[PDB]
């Protein structure tokens, strides 16, 4: 009685022997984008903002140091365990992303280029997304497994190792995809969710920029700065490439953080959160659910630090205060200030995300922590409370896109790679730095009235096109990055690229403990803490194949 057992079949399912079929191929593709909107978690967002509290830009926030324990252990660099659930969580989540790209890629390879001529352009998009995940993994773990053989069977996965490739051999495998996307992506994507050629180039460069700051040794310290790598960062940040895509700086800085201006000319590549779309409530950016301020009920995480608020101070010529900024807290009436601060930090006495009907104050309505963690509000991922684009799910979320590559990154990355090349091209990099600084100096749509209502003195000036030392131009480049990318969570990863991680974070730990007493027993450890531990669960399940990171055994 054999016909009897073959009669019931699975219900509402494609079986993994029809998935490779051609009619599902674009289904695998769109599927591979979505997990960037759908596979993250309030405690593990793909902006990596949780793991940017380790830098000088922000605090954890919350009720207190007990609310989100494993994250206050990352902020102060004391108490991280190879077994903390959140480090394991992000390792598995990003590798889930790579599942959908490699499954898309598996089915794409068997397509006939004659029956399907978008074949290479989708392989390109799929390989571009694979490198997106790999890049973030490297930033977080350094010693990562390269999963880019999409024809691997599943049991072949138990033999993979994170030391198969050397650090510079790893970064080249990440580069190697971005490198492909550049060569096969079309120059304009009318569907803005897909990256254009310019995006892959931008991303190819960024990767070579991290690759150039060599860690060729057994430890995390720098072992050199490769010129052949930096010569690739300049190559793919060429404005000729960028212009082919229609990319550039926005008129006003705030345009990149407002729903009314999604996918403008600076959104080089972005994640397309959306509402009113058939999903249960989303596709919202749920991952930032903790960062919405107390005024909405919950939860007050991801607060800017004073060390960041003060870094927007400026002198009388409108330049930053490189040697004296953090001494005295920013006083609105006296000191000059970079406009970029009022699109980055929302401060007490000022309108919360430009809505004068909500003036931040210092009370139970704005600090869940009664001031333990301060009274500042990140603004680059929240929105106007009155926005039609803000729904309440588990936590509060918007459809405000997430920009992975802004174009100001294309320019400041280019400037850094010119300055460190010191082939006499430093004056072309100061011209880049000015483009970004001149823009911000004028970015006062929505805060123009702040001079007479709250007393704010705007003054930002570009640098005079003269001869500069390398070590000085690298200071001017770091500061432009500092103000331009506040709270956008590339911060800590910059300090680790520059090899300054230990010195800067420890200095910050000292300077700031008088202002946020959670930082009072903090201590970064050189050659240990520039990266996270390979998660214990993951080492332990590999049965010998995974090496841990330096300084964790």
């Amino acid at each position: 009685c054999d016909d009897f057992l073959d009669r019931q079949v699975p219900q509402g399912i494609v079986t993994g022997d029809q998935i490779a079929s051609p009619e599902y191929v674009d289904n695998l593709v769109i599927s591979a984008y979505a997990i960037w909107a759908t596979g993250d978690d309030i405690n593990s967002s793909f902006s990596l903002w949780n793991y940017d509290v380790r830098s000088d830009d922000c605090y954890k926030g919350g009720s207190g140091t007990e609310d989100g324990g494993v994250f206050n252990a990352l902020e102060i660099s004391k108490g991280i365990n190879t077994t903390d659930w959140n480090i394991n969580d992000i390792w598995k989540r990003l590798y889930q992303c790579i599942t959908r790209a490699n499954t898309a890629l598996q089915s794409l390879d068997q397509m006939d280029e004659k029956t399907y001529p978008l074949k290479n352009q989708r392989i390109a998009e799929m390989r571009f997304l694979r490198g997106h995940a790999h890049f973030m993994l490297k930033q977080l773990f350094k010693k990562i497994v390269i999963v880019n053989d999409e024809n691997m069977e599943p049991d072949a996965y138990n033999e993979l190792s994170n030391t198969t490739y050397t650090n510079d051999e790893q970064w080249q495998k990440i580069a190697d995809d971005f490198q492909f996307a550049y060569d096969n992506l079309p120059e304009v994507q009318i569907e803005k969710g897909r990256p254009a050629q310019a995006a892959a180039a931008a991303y190819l460069a960024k990767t070579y920029l991290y690759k150039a700051y060599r860690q060729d040794g057994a430890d995390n310290a720098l072992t050199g700065i490769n010129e052949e790598d930096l010569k690739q960062v300049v190559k793919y940040t060429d404005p000729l490439i960028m212009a082919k895509g229609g990319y550039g700086l926005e008129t006003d800085y705030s345009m990149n953080f407002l729903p009314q201006y999604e996918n403008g000319a600076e959104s080089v590549w972005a994640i397309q959160y959306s509402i009113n779309d058939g999903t249960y409530n989303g596709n919202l950016n749920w991952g930032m659910g903790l960062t919405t301020p107390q005024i909405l009920g919950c939860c007050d995480f991801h607060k800017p630090s004073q060390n960041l608020v003060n870094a927007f101070k400026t002198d009388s010529q409108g330049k930053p205060l490189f040697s004296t900024y953090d001494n005295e807290n920013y006083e609105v009436a006296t000191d000059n200030v970079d406009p970029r601060l009022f699109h980055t930090v929302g401060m007490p006495g000022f309108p919360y995300k430009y809505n004068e009907g909500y003036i931040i104050q210092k009370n139970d309505d704005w600090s869940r922590s009664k001031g333990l963690y301060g009274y500042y509000v990140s603004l680059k991922e929240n929105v106007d409370p009155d926005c039609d684009c803000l729904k309440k799910g588990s936590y509060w979320a918007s459809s405000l896109n997430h920009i992975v590559i802004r174009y100001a990154d294309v320019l400041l990355m280019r400037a850094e790679a010119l300055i460190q090349l010191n082939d006499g091209r430093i004056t072309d990099a100061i011209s880049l730095i000015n483009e970004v600084r001149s823009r911000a100096a004028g970015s006062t749509m929505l805060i123009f009235n702040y001079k007479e209502d709250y007393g704010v003195n705007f003054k930002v000036t570009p640098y005079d096109l003269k001869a500069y030392a390398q070590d000085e131009a690298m200071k001017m480049l770091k500061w432009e990055r500092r103000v331009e990318f506040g709270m956008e969570s590339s911060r800590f990863f910059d300090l680790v690229r520059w090899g300054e991680a230990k010195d800067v974070i420890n200095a910050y730990y000292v300077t700031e403990a008088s202002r946020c007493s959670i930082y009072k027993n903090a201590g970064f450890t050189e050659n240990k803490n520039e990266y996270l531990p390979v998660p214990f669960e993951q080492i332990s399940a590999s049965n010998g194949n995974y090496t841990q990171n330096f300084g964790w055994h």
């Binding site: 009720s63 207190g64 609310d67 107390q294 919950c298 939860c299 139970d364 869940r368 922590s369 009664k370």
Partner: protein, 50 residues
């Protein structure tokens, strides 16, 4: 009964009242933990009848 009601009744601080002072339903406020009145969750459940 909804999943883990008892396990929710036991990690809700005794300061939070069952009723607010207008007679609606009590709940947390400010820094107090993100967790709802169990007695009110039992009310809002009371017609979910199979």
């Amino acid at each position: 009964a909804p999943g883990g009601i008892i396990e929710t009744a036991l990690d809700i601080p005794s300061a939070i009242p069952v009723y607010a002072s207008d007679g609606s339903w009590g709940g947390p406020v400010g820094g107090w933990p993100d967790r709802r009145n169990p007695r009110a969750v039992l009310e809002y459940n009371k017609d979910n009848r199979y």
